[PDB]
Symmetry: D2
Subunit: 341 residues, 4 copies
């Protein structure tokens, strides 16, 4: 049979948090729920923010963080149509959102995620509706697969779904985190030329190895001026503006006329500044991006498989080493931090 | 036979200007030049700034201000095909932006406009390339036609060309200047609701007579709330953010998830500002709008005719009263200041 | 307390049908089911074909026809959240097409619809998943609301969602059936000109009273010429090609370069036909239109309200006179045949 | 100095033609004309049709065929701004058309090309406006460069500009001519998977060598059924439907829901047939495509250079061997037929 009890990482409080190992009964699957045995969880920077700030959310305690997982289906409810036991799955970051229009209202934009308004995935089994998972990619292991729901999909959503990247485009990726690295890979597979900015030479070295066309050390030179040199003054067709700390004003100077700037982050009350000169005169699109919908996820998964794309994982951590995994999170990882079960 | 001499308002310097009347020869028409007897000129706020600050432009002196005119073709060069004598025409604000990709570079966004990098139109005859005119609307006098190449076209470009505004959309128009009111007129012709914001009851009442469905006095109430209340919390489909209005961070809160915010602007030094949260969670497209191209202009002209749209004109001034018109131009015109020849 | 028994028009066979009155128990509502008292049903031409030919469908017998209804919610299941008792609703033609990518496969395009792969609505109560309804328009009686899920939505989908129709566009609507007339009403609300084609002066006169700018009798004159003459040779921005109208090759000649032709259709065996030349040299988008999704429906409902759009209804028939209504349905209704409960 | 006389291939008549070597004076450059010394000309199937049918065009005799050339600028007129002597150029297929809206009217779609309404390029020097050439790619020789104006641009226009190809998409290329091969290459560089159809095993062998993912011999198997097998029944995201002889009806069966079908050809009065089943139910876009505008050309050129794309040339022919080059044209070449000077 299946086992009676499961372990999860759980907290009674946030901001501050006391996250720890708890053991509770495996919950019962409803008619449409599936039970997944968790193989891998990918951490995201927002999990640190939910744990440490609360992020304004109404959380159900005990709270379990994290949203991105890959696993194997153990049991399906009487009316499950999407999966059978044995199927490999990954979870979806924004469960409501299946395709098209972003949920939320003008007053209240914040859609419900996993590891937030909805339960997180940092437990041995997860029991959620069938419609909240998609088939995992055939060509990736559990760990690699866990990276896609959030970072993978964001990069993909920005560049492809919203962006329409073309072969020959010049893309600027800001930094070397998960979203940025997936951006580099998706841009490269699409035939774009990719420019990475860093404040680390070691990280630019690794980026060069993934196939970045150019690296700019922005503590050593003026990156905007370098983008000009690299583009024959044309500017970047697309800029993944991440953290908007090396932000918007600079991005507006670098972007080509009619180009695109995707602003990716999570920061609750950060302030974006820009000169209304390039903004008016080059007429770029400035587009807010968070994650994507599950039809976009399923597109990505197929693309991953057909391209042989390999997610960048900085480190895999054993399940009992979640405290260390979260710590690696504030140290700026090259690619993804993944927990293996 | 034609006249040998023509008058114009020109200045030998900028910052500040010394704009006086002057009389010079009617220039020679080249093979592809047409000679146009000016019937009307619309003033734009940038005309003031070009005269007072120079706006980092390379102006040929004596410099004539203004970009927006209509008139009657008097003579054409040997090779001209677009127009015959007696044809009615209007200037194109950014000459040689015919369609599609906007001109300019990453480093050098600016494009060339009339009454700026190219000569102004505030003279008795204009002598320019045939390609810098389009056929005037058939349904309008010259004063009305002259309103279109900048103000007309900015709103048409923001709402229809790039905006794809649909019937049933809610639109928020900030202020009551020239772009704002074409904003309302085109939004109403598209079957959308228009909410006008203003700091003056009298302007609001005038707006209502033009057929604004709602008007908000931003000095009485938080207009963001009133937008929520007006759209049952959905917030607004399209917000025309006219740079000296109510703010970017303000319209971010007011915009509907996946909605659009068009940034339309003045001063060459305004710095934006906005919170990241709405930009991200709500994912609107924020798009700077620098007027528009010639094929969009031809579209707007056609639509003006089949719609029977009447441009809003605050006051017509005689050629001799340009100074008086420049004064009106910075008392916040309700609509357009036009000089009638 | 609710009734124990309800009546319906059903048939034990198709090809041909033997549609009679029948009385069965009010079905049980599941957790996410709502029970709706039917107030009106709109008939669609496909209802006739489903009954007479079966249209290669896997119908559960006894089979009830029709897909388009509105009514009042009577009871909801334990878990239902979309609607409360007393709420006014309309059916969704293709249930579970919520937004975005259309369901189906390369091999198996067909999707599931009400009154087809799923049960019909031509009964006294309907019992279906909450997700298969949207809130009714506030501005309309039930007869009018019931016109929207198929005819309403096809024209909204072709012209606005996929079509991006702008004010000032010229639109050609073939015939005067249900999709044609929403075509006109939505085109007029968007500020476009509508040209109606027909083989009947009386229909044309009725069309004109609805506000068609021009009507062509295709039996008097070559309507392609009349379109050229009407648009100074530009030809038409958007042509609604209703499969039993005037032809695909005909609208190819009539469409403006880079214009759009929406193909909307009936018989499961019609073969198109067109010359290559216009298709190539003029490059229109030709787009088959199979109704639309649920979020588009919600858009259309909103727009119907803020516009004050009144759907065109040819005749209301009582529940008992379905046969009479099926007869009207193939005498070429001007607009919609509705059955009123 | 330059020489006084030049050679061209020229005909006094078409349909039938008597094309032959003539020698005439090098024409004088006007103020905006440039003089290019021709290095390579790429033949296109339409040149055979103009020569042998006339193609309905009003031709200026002596007529010189062909439209696609690469050369070196010899002399520029007094007002030439775009090029100086020594610059490498290629010509543009549709000179009017710079960006955006396709020229032509509803009644008269056929835009003016080189080798037709405008002079052809099969002469030692060509004297045309500066605006009718673009910079040649830095990374290609004359011959390879001559292939781009037409075939290159069509494929690019269909797949990228109109199509928005994505990485992971499945593309069907019909046949092995110029447009189809460029399609394969552009699709591959974009990360798509490419399926080629042929009635030649030898040609599928060569296609495999260019990086085609799959080849279907359509005289040996049912290609539509194979596309299903290759896509797990999903169908093709994009189909380059060329010659529409292996045509539309079949393409409609193969295309994915919401997929795209580009119809490419030239054929004056060919008839396209399709079943209105998939067309309605999968709701693809069917899009006429001929060539593109010069901003699209300049995008392609940059992409070519940044990707290291190498045009497929079946054979290069010496200038005096144009009769043989045209003959190779009716024999179905693998890629392009190029004349070297």
């Amino acid at each position: 049979m299946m086992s009676k009890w499961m372990q999860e990482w759980s907290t009674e409080t946030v901001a501050p948090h006391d996250l720890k190992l708890a053991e509770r009964p495996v919950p019962e699957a409803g008619e449409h729920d599936i039970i997944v045995r968790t193989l891998a969880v990918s951490l995201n920077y927002r999990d640190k923010l939910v744990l440490e700030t609360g992020m304004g959310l109404d959380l159900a305690f005990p709270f379990v963080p994290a949203s991105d997982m890959s696993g194997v289906v153990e049991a399906v409810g009487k009316s499950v149509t999407r999966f059978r036991p044995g199927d490999r799955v990954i979870s979806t970051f924004a469960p409501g959102w299946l395709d098209g229009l972003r949920p939320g209202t003008g007053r209240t934009p914040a859609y419900e995620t996993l590891g937030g308004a909805h339960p997180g995935v940092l437990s041995e089994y997860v029991v959620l509706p069938e419609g909240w998972f998609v088939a995992a990619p055939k060509s990736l292991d559990a760990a690699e697969a866990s990276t896609l729901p959030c970072a993978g999909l964001t990069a993909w959503f920005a560049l492809v779904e919203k962006g329409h990247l073309r072969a020959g485009d010049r893309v600027v990726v800001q930094g070397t985190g998960g979203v940025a690295l997936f951006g580099l890979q998706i841009a490269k597979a699409t035939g774009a030329e990719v420019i990475v900015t860093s404040s680390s030479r070691e990280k630019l070295d690794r980026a060069f190895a993934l196939g970045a066309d150019h690296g700019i050390n922005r503590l050593e030179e003026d990156w905007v001026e370098r983008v000009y040199a690299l583009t024959g003054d044309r500017g970047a067709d697309h800029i993944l503006e991440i953290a908007g700390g090396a932000g918007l004003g600079q991005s507006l100077k670098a972007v080509a006329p009619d180009g695109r700037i995707s602003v990716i982050g999570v920061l609750e009350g950060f302030e974006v500044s820009g000169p209304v000169g390039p903004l008016l005169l080059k007429s770029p699109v400035v587009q807010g991006i968070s994650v994507g919908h599950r039809r976009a996820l399923e597109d990505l998964v197929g693309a991953v498989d057909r391209l042989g794309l390999k997610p960048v994982i900085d480190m895999r951590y054993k399940f009992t080493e979640v405290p260390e995994a979260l710590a690696h999170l504030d140290r700026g990882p090259f690619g993804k931090v993944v927990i293996e079960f």
